[PDB]
Amino acid sequence: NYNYLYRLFRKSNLKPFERDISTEIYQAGSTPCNGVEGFNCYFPLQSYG
Amino acid sequence: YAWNRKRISNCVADYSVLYNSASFSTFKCYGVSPTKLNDLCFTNVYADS
Numbered sequence A: 001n002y003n004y005l006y007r008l009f010r011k012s013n014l015k016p017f018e019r020d021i022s023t024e025i026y027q028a029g030s031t032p033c034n035g036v037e038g039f040n041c042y043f044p045l046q047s048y049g
Numbered sequence B: 001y002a003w004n005r006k007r008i009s010n011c012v013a014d015y016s017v018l019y020n021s022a023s024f025s026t027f028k029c030y031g032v033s034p035t036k037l038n039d040l041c042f043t044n045v046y047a048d049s
C-alpha cells in the first residue's frame, strides 16, 4: 500500500498546526529549477512502503 | 575489493565546487544534507575511490 504520501523537502520548518499541500518540485542546489523538472530537482512527496 | 582509503583531516570540506559542478551524475547523502553540510564540523573523513 503506497497510497500514503509524505513530504520530504521544504524551504523551512513549518509552524505548529500548519498544513502544506504544495506539490511544486524542490531544488536542493543554487541552480534554478524551471518547469516541472531540472538538475537535482526532487519531488517533495514520497510514498510509504 | 582493494578500494583505496585516503584520510582527509585538518582542512575545509567545501562542497560548492563539488555540488555545483555538473560533472557528477549521482550523489545522495543518506545521513546529512548539503544545506547543513556547510555549518557542520567533522573529526576525520576518509575517501574510498
Ligand SMILES: *[C@@H]1O[C@H](CO)[C@@H](O[C@@H]2O[C@H](CO)[C@@H](O)[C@H](O)[C@H]2NC(C)=O)[C@H](O)[C@H]1NC(C)=O
Pocket (backbone or CB within 6 Å): B016, B017, B018, B020, B021, B022, B023
Ligand atoms: C578537478 O575537478 C574539478 C571539477 O569540479 C575541475 O575544476 C572545475 O570545477 C568546476 C565546478 O564548479 C567546473 O565548473 C569547472 O569546469 C572545472 N574546471 C575544468 C573542467 O577545467 C578541475 O579542472 C579538475 N582538475 C583536473 C582535471 O586536472
